Structure 1
Amino acid sequence: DSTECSNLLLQYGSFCTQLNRALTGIAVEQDKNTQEVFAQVKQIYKTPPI
């Protein structure tokens, strides 16, 4: 949160935005990986009381 540094970092162009976009793709994939394994069942089946 230095403004003096931040205005120099703007001169490097897209690098900062494409690092955030890469890590966001990792994060959205982790929820997809979890759906593909567990969310296969259509209905929440229950065992009988006996």
Structure 2
Amino acid sequence: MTKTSVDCTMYICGDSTECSNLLLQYGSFCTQLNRALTGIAVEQDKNTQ
């Protein structure tokens, strides 16, 4: 399936600096989501191979 990667920072907080600081308080949720998605994207290459 089409590999989709979403930046947690860009989608949630947006361009605004204030949103970035508030996002930081939450933790590694922004980061953890990226890991899951790339892995799905990486997996799709392996399947075709």
Normalising by structure 2, report the TM-score.
0.69
Runs of at least 5 residues in structure 1 that lack an aligned partner in the other structure: 36-50
Q: May I ask how many residue pairs the two structures share in their alignment? A: 35
Computing the radius of gyration over CA atoms, which structure comes out larger, 1 or 2? 1
Normalising by structure 1, report the TM-score.
0.68
RMSD: 0.4
Task: Tell which has more relative contact order, 1 or 2 (C-alpha 8 A, sep 6+).
Answer: 2
Q: Which runs of 4+ in 1 moved over 4 A?
A: none
Identity %: 100
Runs of at least 5 residues in structure 2 that lack an aligned partner in the other structure: 1-14
